[PDB]
């Protein structure tokens, strides 16, 4: 995972460092070709940096680092602000809540209902997954749909 990958990255770094320890200017006179094998290796390294820049989307790297470290600073200021609170200052409710907000919408809305008073159908039977129709995309079924359709109205309103 993260650690293993980080360890692998560290292993790349030591190898990169060792090369620097060696000095090759003496070698420049000797051979044109040696550079190409090395230059290609260097171009592979540059390629990854370019990919990283694209994901973010030397000078490119510098501007991107400023953007990354700007984002990081805000997060900690938000954490510290919350714990220290625990001219007019804006108040926002959403940050406080124990389950934080999820805008991903990865899966179809999952009802937050955990109990079902005044039930004609089990909550069990109510929480279920239905395969999508070719005509229509599948959706979670409202949990009181049956109750609404088949429960009887009080005599009084009528």
């Amino acid at each position: 995972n993260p650690d293993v990958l980080l360890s692998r990255v560290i292993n790349v770094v030591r190898a990169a460092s060792s090369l620097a320890s060696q000095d090759v200017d003496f070698y420049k006179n000797l051979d044109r070709g040696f550079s190409k094998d090395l230059k290609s290796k260097a171009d592979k390294l540059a390629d990854m940096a370019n990919e990283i820049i694209l994901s973010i989307d030397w000078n490119n790297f510098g501007n991107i680092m400023d953007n990354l470290l700007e984002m990081s600073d805000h997060s900690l200021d938000k954490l510290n602000c919350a714990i220290n609170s625990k001219t007019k200052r804006v108040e926002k409710p959403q940050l406080k809540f124990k389950s934080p907000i999820d805008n991903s919408e990865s899966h179809p809305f999952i009802p937050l209902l955990k109990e079902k008073p005044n039930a004609l159908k089990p909550l069990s039977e109510s929480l279920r997954l239905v395969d999508d129709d070719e005509n229509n995309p599948s959706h979670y079924p409202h949990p009181y749909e049956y109750e609404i359709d088949h429960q009887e109205y009080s005599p009084e309103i009528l």
């Binding site: 989307d57 501007n63 953007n67 700007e70 959403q94 907000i101 805008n103 991903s104």
Partner: protein, 100 residues
């Protein structure tokens, strides 16, 4: 539009708070190629597009290249139509015409 939706779903904000439609119109009409033209537009500028103004300047440059490619292609397409009409006459036999 995609970006703003992306940020609005990130920081959990309204699309108009990230960027109003009037300010977006200034980006489409004027098209600032630098980070200087992005920050100063119309009356005021919100907080979300101010920090990502460099990206917006980059985006406009990213946007600009595509528009240019389309224009060169278009002239060629019109010419062929009389030629298309030619093929039918070619296909019909000369021999029949003397017959009819």
């Amino acid at each position: 539009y995609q970006w703003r939706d992306l940020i609005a779903r990130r920081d959990d904000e309204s699309p108009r708070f990230v960027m109003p439609n009037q300010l977006l119109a200034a980006l489409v009409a004027y098209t600032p190629t630098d980070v200087i033209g992005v920050v100063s537009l119309t009356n005021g500028v919100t907080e979300h597009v101010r920090q990502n103004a460099k990206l917006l300047a980059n985006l406009i440059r990213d946007a600009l290249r595509n528009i240019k490619n389309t224009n060169e292609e278009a002239t060629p397409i019109p010419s062929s139509e009389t030629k298309a009409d030619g093929i039918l006459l070619e296909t019909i036999s000369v021999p029949q015409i003397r017959d009819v």
